[PDB]
Design an enzyme around this catalytic site. Structure first.
Site, PDB file in Angstrom:
ATOM      1  N   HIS A   1      35.281  36.606  38.084  1.00 28.30           N
ATOM      2  CA  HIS A   1      35.680  36.492  36.695  1.00 28.30           C
ATOM      3  C   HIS A   1      35.594  37.711  35.754  1.00 28.30           C
ATOM      4  O   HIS A   1      36.340  37.783  34.783  1.00 28.30           O
ATOM      5  CB  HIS A   1      34.851  35.355  36.100  1.00 28.30           C
ATOM      6  CG  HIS A   1      35.179  35.033  34.679  1.00 28.30           C
ATOM      7  ND1 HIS A   1      36.422  34.592  34.287  1.00 28.30           N
ATOM      8  CD2 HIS A   1      34.409  35.027  33.569  1.00 28.30           C
ATOM      9  CE1 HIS A   1      36.412  34.359  32.986  1.00 28.30           C
ATOM     10  NE2 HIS A   1      35.197  34.599  32.531  1.00 28.30           N
TER      11      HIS A   1
ATOM     12  N   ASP B   1      38.170  36.505  28.665  1.00 24.42           N
ATOM     13  CA  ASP B   1      37.683  35.127  28.497  1.00 24.42           C
ATOM     14  C   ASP B   1      38.061  34.711  27.053  1.00 24.42           C
ATOM     15  O   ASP B   1      39.248  34.879  26.665  1.00 24.42           O
ATOM     16  CB  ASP B   1      36.174  35.176  28.889  1.00 24.42           C
ATOM     17  CG  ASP B   1      35.460  33.843  28.880  1.00 24.42           C
ATOM     18  OD1 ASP B   1      35.064  33.407  27.785  1.00 24.42           O
ATOM     19  OD2 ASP B   1      35.150  33.290  29.985  1.00 24.42           O
TER      20      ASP B   1
END
Ligand SMILES: [Ca+2]
Ligand SMILES: [Ca+2]
Ligand SMILES: [Ca+2]
Ligand SMILES: [Cl-]
Lengths: 302, 301
Positions: free
Chosen positions: A280, A114
């Site tokens: 994710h 991320d």
């Protein structure tokens, strides 16, 4: 300087330290294992505990270094500037090599998730001799994302347009109910039976409830839409020199919208990647599968 | 019709709740005499956005100021999963039904913000009923979503926030309705103080109702989904009545599009100009708004 802050209460075998860098910043780091240096760098809205499920295994063959991003976790959270330089990926990247300089390592392997992946991309460009290889998790390049803004992108990634509004709008909204916003950022990421326990969620919440982190997070996003793009255009002809690996969730948002490996071809020399059975955060959701894939890559890099 | 007393903000106007054929009840302010001129507000206002220009217009027309369904004091019915209940086709139907109930036939129309998106669909669904249209500070919905880019999603971020699935935006606005109202109004206006605190208070009275907050979201969700279907389904159609575009030179819509140009692709007879204000000329520069509207209505009627 290094100050010892006891053992990690969440990651067995790791020691927590506060390290003061030459830029005057203090960062929180967890270090464990022995062997060649491996940095695993978290993203938003987490801290370094996102590596709790994989770090001890990795520590069997490496000196694993888990920093908290500036503005995140328990690292310093300096007030910012109008151009958002203080939270730019260039500044964040600089935090990482200065930490390595302080721990005495020269060259190192880097993994980033991320925000951590964006830091890594800039790290690999500003310091090509330092990084031996890269693994970016669940991201496409920052410039690419914004350049392809369309109805669909703005809908699926609406925070990329909300977190960047001028101060103090997003900071005020999030502060209304931090746990609620954290749940959206976390339960949206997983959506596959409890990858994040109540204990780990509480630890992330403990940090997220500090308005100084809330603001740093918004400055990070603001930078990504401004100063980071200026930096990325200024050297768009340059390419990541070291081997690059992409690991992304086949059921995450970015994996369902773009050809992940395809977004990194113009940006790097040698690339490779694969989709994992998660959304994710593969390090939290499918840790065992994540380790295997990272190990193969790390051990293939000569 | 059921009388609700004199308007507390618009001299000479009467408040009424009118029950249409579709079972819905809408709040409306009516004043003046003469041919019917409808003025329809948008988000996050109610019919009081027209307080500064309505009485002047009431001298030559019967001025009708409805609150859109979901807004102000009008009903706020339960929505459906496809968002058809707050689609611009349905909203337009409320208007023509309102006119049938007040006894009017053809009428002049003016629409700001969501009100103009309703008028777009109104002129396309009922070309005979509309003598002329004036849309304020809007480019067609399909054109706006189609040209979606970084500065657009940044400047009009609410077009990507209010459309998030239920109950996300509703929950967020509910944390502090007044805060989120204030940010909207501040971002709309360029002429500082055009919305007095009293005027703001009246908008807040309605906006803090959770039923209004839900309906607003449904409305934006309609525009991102079912509204666009309708617009594609008759993309070859064009507005036949005269069309006027008044927008704010100092605002977002003014700076991103060739406003007149975006409408030439949707209408046969088009004109317009930028006014020296942000999003709401009826509040920011009333005199110039009246002057401009009157010449159009005179040149056309
Ligand atoms: Ca390039
Ligand atoms: Ca009212
Ligand atoms: Ca303003
Ligand atoms: Cl990210």
């Amino acid at each position: 300087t290094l100050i010892e802050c006891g053992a990690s209460p969440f990651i067995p075998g790791f020691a927590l330290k506060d390290v003061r860098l030459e830029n005057g910043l203090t960062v929180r780091v967890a270090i464990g294992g022995s062997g060649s240096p491996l940095v695993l760098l978290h993203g938003h809205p987490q801290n370094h505990t996102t590596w709790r499920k994989v770090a001890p295994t990795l520590a069997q063959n490496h000196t694993v270094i888990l920093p908290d991003l500036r503005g995140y976790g328990d690292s310093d959270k300096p007030t910012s500037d109008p151009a958002h330089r203080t939270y730019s990926k260039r500044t964040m990247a600089q935090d990482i090599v200065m930490l390595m300089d302080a721990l005495g390592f020269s060259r190192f392997a880097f993994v980033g998730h991320d925000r951590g992946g964006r830091v890594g991309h800039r790290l690999a460009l500003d310091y090509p001799d330092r990084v031996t290889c890269c693994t970016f998790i669940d991201i496409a390049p920052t410039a690419t994302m914004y350049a392809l803004t369309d109805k669909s992108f703005a809908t699926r990634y609406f925070w990329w347009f909300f977190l960047i509004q001028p101060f103090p709008l997003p900071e005020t909204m999030i502060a209304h109910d931090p746990a609620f916003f954290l749940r959206k950022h976390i339960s949206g990421q997983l959506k596959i039976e409890g990858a994040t326990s109540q204990e780990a969620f509480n630890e992330y919440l403990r940090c997220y409830q500090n308005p100084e982190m809330i603001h740093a997070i918004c400055e990070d996003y603001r930078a990504a839409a401004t100063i980071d793009l200026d930096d990325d255009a200024a050297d768009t002809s340059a390419r990541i020199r070291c081997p690059l690996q992409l690991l992304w969730g086949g059921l995450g948002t970015v994996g369902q919208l773009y050809n992940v490996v395809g977004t990194w071809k113009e940006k790097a020399l040698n690339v490779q990647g694969e989709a994992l059975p998660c959304g994710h955060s593969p390090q939290e959701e499918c840790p065992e599968y994540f380790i295997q894939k990272l190990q193969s890559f790390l051990h293939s890099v000569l």
